[PDB]
Amino acid sequence: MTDPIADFLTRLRNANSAYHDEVSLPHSKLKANIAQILKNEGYISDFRTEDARVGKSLVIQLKYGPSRERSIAGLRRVSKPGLRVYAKSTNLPRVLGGLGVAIISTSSGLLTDRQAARQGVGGEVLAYVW
Amino acid sequence: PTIQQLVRKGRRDKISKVKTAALKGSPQRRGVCTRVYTTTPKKPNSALRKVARVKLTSQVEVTAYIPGEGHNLQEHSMVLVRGGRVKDLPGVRYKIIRGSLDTQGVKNRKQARSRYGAKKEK
RNA sequence: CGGGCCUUGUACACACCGCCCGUCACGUCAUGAAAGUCGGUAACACCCGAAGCCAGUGGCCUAACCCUCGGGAGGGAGCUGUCGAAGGUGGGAUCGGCGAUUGGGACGAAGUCGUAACAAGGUAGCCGUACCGGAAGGUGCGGCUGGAUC
RNA sequence: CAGCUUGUUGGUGGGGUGACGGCCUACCAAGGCGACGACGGGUAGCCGGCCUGAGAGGGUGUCCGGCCACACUGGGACUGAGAUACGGCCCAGACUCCUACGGGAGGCAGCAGUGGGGAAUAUUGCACAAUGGGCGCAAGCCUGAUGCAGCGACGCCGCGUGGGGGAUGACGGCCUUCGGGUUGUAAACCUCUUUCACCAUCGACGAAGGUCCGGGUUCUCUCGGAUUGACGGUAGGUGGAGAAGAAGCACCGGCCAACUACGUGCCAGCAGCCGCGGUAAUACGUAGGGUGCGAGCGUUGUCCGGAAUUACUGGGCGUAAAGAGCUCGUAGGUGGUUUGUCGCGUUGUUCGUGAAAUCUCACGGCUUAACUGUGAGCGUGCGGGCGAUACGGGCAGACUAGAGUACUGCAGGGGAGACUGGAAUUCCUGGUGUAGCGGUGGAAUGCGCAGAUAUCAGGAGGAACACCGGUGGCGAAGGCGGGUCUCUGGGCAGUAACUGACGCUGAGGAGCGAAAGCGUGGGGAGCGAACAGGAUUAGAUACCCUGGUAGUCCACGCCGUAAACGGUGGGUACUAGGUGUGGGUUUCCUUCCUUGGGAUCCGUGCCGUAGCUAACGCAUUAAGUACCCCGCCUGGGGAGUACGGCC
RNA sequence: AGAAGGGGGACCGGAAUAUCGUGAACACCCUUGCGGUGGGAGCGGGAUCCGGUCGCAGAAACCAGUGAGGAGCGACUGUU
Ligand SMILES: [Mg+2]
Ligand SMILES: [Mg+2]
Ligand SMILES: [Mg+2]
Ligand SMILES: [Mg+2]
Ligand SMILES: [Mg+2]
Ligand SMILES: [Mg+2]
Ligand SMILES: [Mg+2]
Ligand SMILES: [Mg+2]
Ligand SMILES: [Mg+2]
Ligand SMILES: [Mg+2]
Ligand SMILES: [Mg+2]
Ligand SMILES: [Mg+2]
Ligand SMILES: [Mg+2]
Ligand SMILES: [Mg+2]
Ligand SMILES: [Mg+2]
Ligand SMILES: [Mg+2]
Ligand SMILES: [Mg+2]
Ligand SMILES: [Mg+2]
Ligand SMILES: [Mg+2]
Ligand SMILES: [Mg+2]
Ligand SMILES: [Mg+2]
Ligand SMILES: [Mg+2]
Ligand SMILES: [Mg+2]
Ligand SMILES: [Mg+2]
Ligand SMILES: [Mg+2]
Ligand SMILES: [Mg+2]
Ligand SMILES: [Mg+2]
Ligand SMILES: [Mg+2]
Ligand SMILES: [Mg+2]
Ligand SMILES: [Mg+2]
Ligand SMILES: [Mg+2]
Ligand SMILES: [Mg+2]
Ligand SMILES: [Mg+2]
Ligand SMILES: [Mg+2]
Ligand SMILES: [Mg+2]
Ligand SMILES: [Mg+2]
Ligand SMILES: [Mg+2]
Ligand SMILES: [Mg+2]
Ligand SMILES: [Mg+2]
Ligand SMILES: [Mg+2]
Ligand SMILES: [Mg+2]
Ligand SMILES: [Mg+2]
Ligand SMILES: [Mg+2]
Ligand SMILES: [Mg+2]
Ligand SMILES: [Mg+2]
Ligand SMILES: [Mg+2]
Ligand SMILES: [Mg+2]
Ligand SMILES: [Mg+2]
Ligand SMILES: [Mg+2]
Ligand SMILES: [Mg+2]
Ligand SMILES: [Mg+2]
Ligand SMILES: [Mg+2]
Ligand SMILES: [Mg+2]
Ligand SMILES: [Mg+2]
Ligand SMILES: [Mg+2]
Ligand SMILES: [Mg+2]
Ligand SMILES: [Mg+2]
Ligand SMILES: [Mg+2]
Ligand SMILES: [Mg+2]
Ligand SMILES: [Mg+2]
Ligand SMILES: [Mg+2]
Ligand SMILES: [Mg+2]
Ligand SMILES: [Mg+2]
Ligand SMILES: [Mg+2]
Ligand SMILES: [Mg+2]
Ligand SMILES: [Mg+2]
Ligand SMILES: [Mg+2]
Ligand SMILES: [Mg+2]
Ligand SMILES: [Mg+2]
Ligand SMILES: [Mg+2]
Ligand SMILES: [Mg+2]
Ligand SMILES: [Mg+2]
Ligand SMILES: [Mg+2]
Ligand SMILES: [Mg+2]
Ligand SMILES: [Mg+2]
Ligand SMILES: [Mg+2]
Ligand SMILES: [Mg+2]
Ligand SMILES: [Mg+2]
Ligand SMILES: [Mg+2]
Ligand SMILES: [Mg+2]
Ligand SMILES: [Mg+2]
Ligand SMILES: [Mg+2]
Ligand SMILES: [Mg+2]
Ligand SMILES: [Mg+2]
Ligand SMILES: [Mg+2]
Ligand SMILES: [Mg+2]
């Protein structure tokens, strides 16, 4: 078992494709921060933290339209544990030509491309969501 | 496969084959043109092709094709050889240049007249 | 014997009067082995060792310095020694060429011998191994279905 | 190419150098390098750059610029601030030349030039006028550097061979359905202008300079005077007459713009591919027509592209090439939740550097352009300082979810050894008994009449274990079933008692690994390669029949391969269900005795949704969605072959 | 395989007075013996390095392997 962030992305993607309304998954600070970013960008509905048998459990409810369509189109881990990926403020990645979101881990916390270019800081490219 | 596997063992391009072997870097090559003869092509063509055995100045013996209709070649005679395939003769990969040291141009030729060698008219 | 419909297998579609395998014979091309033979390369051990630097010796020569005028100091010629290129001797290494004869390979026409595979291809076929046989191959043992059977 | 190294690795004292240093020496110690490729072999000057490419990349190192190396081949030193000392010295060698034979001389990879090699690459030109260089107080003198010229379409750029009107559808050519169409405003003719070439003439900038003479005393400054330019009487300007001196090459089946006629008739020939030509060829040759480009146009050679056919960006492995036969494990790679710290990675900013030229963007100057100057970019980087701590990493802790241990149960052809049971086949002994038996599609070979086959009793011996038995179980795989005993490995469930990330994978390596085969010894019923006979057949080195050796069995070793298969590497998480079956646990329905239903964990099958796939199909036991590590693929043959090596 | 093929070899002096290695006298304890420990004399052995000397020659005379390559037969030591 390696790369829990990729595990988190895979769980969310599979549930979103299976048309599920919520997911459960072991809670870590990094996952909580990524969930906060996703909610702020509007790709999910609200999330919450429970207390499982051992440790804590993180539950995310997924957002769908009036018809049954997904608000999340894709998801892909970028900086894998076998090859870390970093970027500078000059050349932060662009997702769907700007219609998506790329998560950047900076010394000031997790940020999106817009929030990171407006601050002029780079860092590790965690994942694309769009 | 596996960036670590690539780091340990990089990509290696394919192996090509030299085609200019007798010319060995030169665009043309002089030869002595021994033992001129004729050859029948591969199965579905049934023609009579005019060829020659050329001993090149690169100290290699190759077989060349004589283009055009009608030629003045013979036994020992200096020719200028270039590259080119015939696709029906089995292993001929060289052509005699017409309009060079001993191979005079094609007589009565009127179209394209530069291949095969021919001055316009005077 | 021929025909019709459905279903099954197929490497056939010129459509089984189909496709197709391997020896053998003739020819061409490239290549392996081979008693031996001709070249190249880089070293190694030892012998001999030019110039030259360095180290010694130096009765032969020596203007400046010193001298008690006899010489002394210091220098040089020559000579010896270490190192030393080239050369010589020797045993190997390595890269090529040729070689009577011989092994297979590929391609050639409308050659000879069979018919191994493709249909249950007429003994299901393939895989490993062993023996055998002009040749495709056969047989034994184990395996697989990429075969059948109620 | 797997072992290299003995001044080798290090130390001490000396020596030596401009300088540290095994740079050298005497002594002492026994180290040093290597799978992150030492040692060896091949090739090569390196870079700014150039070509290509969307980029990343790939190829390349020619003009120009920087650095290095060398100067007939090898070695050496001297002089000097400084030496690979190209036109210096010494020695040796090869070569060319002179000689009175004793002995001497030489070095174009400087410019120009000659022979040779080659497909192929230039004049034995002018000037120190400008810039740089050396010596001199200076004037000066030297400079094949340099500045120019000559030659070559070798390349890039620019401009010409006219312009404005004009169906005689001139003439002719070619095609025609013989009616016409086309070349075609194209020509004739009318008119206009002369860029460039031609003729004549004037004539430079490059020179706020170099010289001598005058104010300025000199220094600095103008002044004015001569004089000084190789290019060059050139560029350029002016003037003169005249459309006047000036277009070719390739292709026209598809790619790919461009079609007909005649001749030829698998011939002659064409061709990048696949193809075109055997009597009506848009593919051969000519003509007409057309298309592209144009002082050029084609061919050959080489590089990139297209090629996502080496895939980092950006590919794959069920059946197309591709998962090692399976496991354990070394280096390596990768790593659960959580606290603090460091600030190596990462990221922000600033300073230095990243030469010039080339490249990009904007101007500026040559009549335009190529070319040239300026400014800003670019220069992805590296070094120094100062910030940040989300993530990676290090250091110091913590935790139990992964992993392991403990206890209690459970199922099992898991393995090894020893002993042992019965059915049946064969043979031997005896009884009964008489002429056939055996075998095939049909027969024959064969056995028997010397007593077979058949039948009954006794005995010997080897091998395999009917029913149970299955689709089912166990094992990493290969594999494992007569029974009992002895020894021994793993798995699952429950508990949550313990440790506290101890995990995963794994290049090489090691172990195990069907059958056949090999060695030594034993055993040998049945079966049965080879071998023999019979039959079939044209033949039958086979299929069928009758015999029959090795082998099959055992002990101990070797071998190391299989369609060793799920043709699917291992680990982990997640993503509808339905329905069988093996092993547990478990409430409730607890009797509804039902050992039924439900729930949960671990197996093993079928069917099916999403999803995936070229399709077939896979589908919670993935070939789906993702992450970590490993093996493997790059058209078919030659070939899993040769040579080398290991066993 | 002593494969092949090479190099050194005499004398004198010095290192060298424990140079080094053998044995161990005078003199040092004691369970007093035919005892032990240190001690290092005299007497012998061998090798090296450095310097010098001599001849045509340093293995000095006598003594004391020739070596390599390709076939045939028999494996080999042996026996006649
Ligand atoms: Mg009908
Ligand atoms: Mg079909
Ligand atoms: Mg042949
Ligand atoms: Mg050979
Ligand atoms: Mg000397
Ligand atoms: Mg031969
Ligand atoms: Mg067969
Ligand atoms: Mg057949
Ligand atoms: Mg048959
Ligand atoms: Mg058959
Ligand atoms: Mg047989
Ligand atoms: Mg077989
Ligand atoms: Mg079988
Ligand atoms: Mg030493
Ligand atoms: Mg020292
Ligand atoms: Mg070179
Ligand atoms: Mg590309
Ligand atoms: Mg040299
Ligand atoms: Mg020369
Ligand atoms: Mg020299
Ligand atoms: Mg000087
Ligand atoms: Mg000096
Ligand atoms: Mg020199
Ligand atoms: Mg020279
Ligand atoms: Mg010279
Ligand atoms: Mg000089
Ligand atoms: Mg020259
Ligand atoms: Mg030539
Ligand atoms: Mg020539
Ligand atoms: Mg000058
Ligand atoms: Mg000057
Ligand atoms: Mg030309
Ligand atoms: Mg077209
Ligand atoms: Mg015709
Ligand atoms: Mg034609
Ligand atoms: Mg290409
Ligand atoms: Mg590419
Ligand atoms: Mg990739
Ligand atoms: Mg592919
Ligand atoms: Mg895979
Ligand atoms: Mg296949
Ligand atoms: Mg395959
Ligand atoms: Mg497998
Ligand atoms: Mg490890
Ligand atoms: Mg680890
Ligand atoms: Mg680590
Ligand atoms: Mg971590
Ligand atoms: Mg620059
Ligand atoms: Mg301008
Ligand atoms: Mg910095
Ligand atoms: Mg546990
Ligand atoms: Mg046993
Ligand atoms: Mg018996
Ligand atoms: Mg009887
Ligand atoms: Mg009986
Ligand atoms: Mg604890
Ligand atoms: Mg492992
Ligand atoms: Mg391995
Ligand atoms: Mg074994
Ligand atoms: Mg066996
Ligand atoms: Mg055996
Ligand atoms: Mg045998
Ligand atoms: Mg035996
Ligand atoms: Mg039998
Ligand atoms: Mg038989
Ligand atoms: Mg027979
Ligand atoms: Mg295999
Ligand atoms: Mg198997
Ligand atoms: Mg396989
Ligand atoms: Mg797996
Ligand atoms: Mg997997
Ligand atoms: Mg089940
Ligand atoms: Mg596909
Ligand atoms: Mg299915
Ligand atoms: Mg697939
Ligand atoms: Mg082999
Ligand atoms: Mg071999
Ligand atoms: Mg010897
Ligand atoms: Mg010998
Ligand atoms: Mg002497
Ligand atoms: Mg002897
Ligand atoms: Mg022989
Ligand atoms: Mg003989
Ligand atoms: Mg004998
Ligand atoms: Mg024998
Ligand atoms: Mg003997």
UniProtKB/Swiss-Prot annotation, chain A:
Alphabetized UniProt keyword annotations: Ribonucleoprotein, Ribosomal protein, RNA-binding, rRNA-binding
Protein name: Small ribosomal subunit protein uS8
Upper lineage: Bacteria, Bacillati, Actinomycetota, Actinomycetes, Mycobacteriales
GO MF annotations, alphabetized: rRNA binding; structural constituent of ribosome
Gene Ontology cellular-component terms listed: cytosolic small ribosomal subunit
Similarity section: Belongs to the universal ribosomal protein uS8 family.
PANTHER family documented for this protein: 40S RIBOSOMAL PROTEIN S15A
Source species of the chain: Mycobacterium tuberculosis (strain ATCC 25618 / H37Rv)
Function according to Swiss-Prot or TrEMBL: One of the primary rRNA binding proteins, it binds directly to 16S rRNA central domain where it helps coordinate assembly of the platform of the 30S subunit.
A GO biological-process term: translation
InterPro entries: Ribosomal_uS8, Ribosomal_uS8_CS, Ribosomal_uS8_sf
A Pfam short name: Ribosomal_S8
Quaternary structure annotation from Swiss-Prot or TrEMBL: Part of the 30S ribosomal subunit. Contacts proteins S5 and S12.
Swiss-Prot record, chain B:
Residue ranges, annotated region (Disordered): 104-122
GO BP, one annotated term: response to antibiotic
GO molecular function: rRNA binding; structural constituent of ribosome; tRNA binding
Gene3D superfamilies found in the cross-reference section: Nucleic acid-binding proteins (2.40.50.140)
Compositional bias ranges of the Basic residues kind: 107-117
UniProtKB keywords: Antibiotic resistance, Ribonucleoprotein, Ribosomal protein, RNA-binding, rRNA-binding, tRNA-binding
Effect of residue 42 to T: In strain: TCVGH25; probably resistant to streptomycin
InterPro entries recorded: NA-bd_OB-fold (IPR012340), Ribosomal_uS12 (IPR006032), Ribosomal_uS12_bac (IPR005679)
A GO cellular component entry from the record: ribosome
Membership in a protein family: Belongs to the universal ribosomal protein uS12 family.
Quaternary structure note: Part of the 30S ribosomal subunit. Contacts proteins S8 and S17. May interact with IF1 in the 30S initiation complex.
PANTHER family membership: 30S RIBOSOMAL PROTEIN S12 FAMILY MEMBER (PTHR11652)
Function, in words: With S4 and S5 plays an important role in translational accuracy.
Identification of the protein by name: Small ribosomal subunit protein uS12
Organism: Mycobacterium tuberculosis (strain ATCC 25618 / H37Rv)
